[PDB]
Write a protein that binds this ligand. Structure first.
Ligand code: HEM
Ligand SMILES: CCc1ccc(C(=O)O)cc1
Ligand SMILES: [Cl-]
Length: 393
């Protein structure tokens, strides 16, 4: 029989220090009942990974946040890709995949590295820098909206927009409800840049709109796939990169390790995604009666998956609380797993690698010199400010 926990994985307290709670979450039982929100949760690597790889049983089309789309109105029209099941998923999925293939990365790869090299140089010129706003936020801001082919004007909405989207997967918090109350300007901006007339020749939005021509997607579909990349494509990478730098900061020996061997960049990043897990949690909904870690769970029940917890399960990882940039990271669920696994992963790693590469060649120490402020959001873990003094090589 399934234990009750009073933990609220969406309270400021939990965000501020999740690690003791996530350990109660695991130790309690393979499946737990969260009184705060009347839902089942699963925090161990094994359970999380299983749920992820049975989309037939654990569907996403009833929402991947708490809210059940069968029971209640989605807060916005649903994603053609996040909030759908195969087969409706498979087409929109395949398209975004071509858009963001390794072929594509090869073409934009030099540009991303050069821009990464430029930021780290400028930063070394100043010394004291905010690792979040001046790097984590600034770098993908200098590469991604361009890769998208966004205009200049409006971009200040891209981050609040992400925040809104990720806050909304959560329970009906103060966090959620406020985000929603404040959402109109952010949606109008995104709705606008979602249109073909507004996407520069040769960028993702443009490349996406091309699938209109051949018919792989309709014109209603097209603005909505773009919408996908404008929700998911930015703040994720802000927090990913954010994690990496914070890790390097807290783990100076691991920085020295990376400097010794700069080819360890890609994986020092991947490790950071495991170790922080910028995207913390997602739900599914049972499509049938299913036995899940010994419990028989009824049809149409929501299950909360602790991604971060999975990624830090002692049952799966030696010394999981450690930053180890030569860890065999393969199998972490930082970008999820299976049919829905992050279609954007190549862009993220692209950014995380070039930037960690630039750092490994350019910086000799990263020390935090200041107050460190966390940002609170229902789905995203990350920092709001991280003051560091960069010392040059
Ligand atoms: C720090 C980098 C990133 C992280 C940690 C991350 C996280 C995730 C996770 C955990 C999923 C699985 C969702 C699920 O199982 O329901 C996912 C899927 C997705 N990601 Fe990412 N992501 C990142 C970067 C990106 C980027 C750069 C893009 C756009 C270029 C993107 C676009 C998407 C989209 C559209 C999906 C839904 C795919 C599907 O359901 O088939 N992500 N991401
Ligand atoms: C990375 C999480 C995420 C993935 C896809 C969407 C979307 O399709 O709007 C929104 C969020
Ligand atoms: Cl929207």
């Amino acid at each position: 029989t399934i234990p009750h926990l009073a933990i609220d994985p969406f309270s400021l307290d939990f965000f501020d220090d999740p690690y003791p709670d996530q350990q109660t979450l695991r130790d309690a039982g393979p499946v737990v009942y969260l009184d705060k929100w009347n839902v089942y949760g699963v925090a161990r690597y094994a359970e999380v990974h299983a749920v992820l790889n049975d989309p037939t049983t654990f569907c996403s089309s009833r929402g991947v946040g708490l809210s059940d789309f069968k029971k209640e109105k989605p807060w916005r029209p649903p994603s053609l890709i996040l909030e759908a099941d195969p087969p409706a998923h498979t087409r929109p999925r395949a398209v975004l995949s071509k858009v963001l293939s390794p072929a594509t990365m090869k073409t934009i790869r030099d540009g991303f590295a050069a821009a990464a090299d430029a930021k780290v140089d400028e930063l070394l010129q100043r010394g004291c820098i905010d690792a979040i706003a001046d790097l984590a936020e600034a770098y993908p801001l200098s590469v991604f909206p361009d890769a998208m082919g966004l205009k200049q004007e409006g971009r200040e909405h891209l981050l609040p927009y992400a925040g809104l989207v990720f806050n909304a997967f959560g329970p009906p918090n103060e966090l959620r409800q406020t985000a929603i109350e404040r959402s109109a300007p952010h949606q109008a901006y995104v709705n606008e840049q979602c249109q073909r007339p507004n996407l520069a020749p040769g960028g993702f939005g443009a490349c996406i709109h091309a699938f209109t021509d051949t018919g792989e997607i309709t014109p209603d579909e097209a603005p909505l796939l773009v919408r996908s990349l404008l929700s998911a494509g930015l703040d994720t990478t802000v927090n990913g990169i954010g994690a990496a730098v914070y890790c390097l900061a807290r783990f100076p020996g691991e920085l020295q390790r990376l400097r010794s061997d700069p080819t360890l960049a890609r994986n020092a990043f991947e490790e950071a995604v495991r170790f922080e897990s910028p995207v913390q949690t997602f739900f599914r909904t049972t499509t049938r009666e299913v036995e899940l870690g010994g419990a028989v769970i009824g049809e149409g029940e929501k299950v909360l998956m602790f991604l971060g917890s999975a990624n830090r399960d002692p049952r799966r990882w030696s010394d999981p609380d450690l930053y180890d940039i030569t860890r065999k990271t393969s199998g972490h669920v930082g970008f999820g797993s299976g049919v829905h696994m992050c279609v954007g992963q190549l862009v993220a790693r692209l950014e995380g690698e070039v930037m960690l590469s630039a750092l490994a060649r350019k910086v000799a120490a990263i020390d935090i010199d200041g107050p460190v402020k966390r940002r609170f959001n229902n789905t995203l873990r990350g920092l709001e400010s991280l003051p560091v003094k960069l010392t040059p090589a």
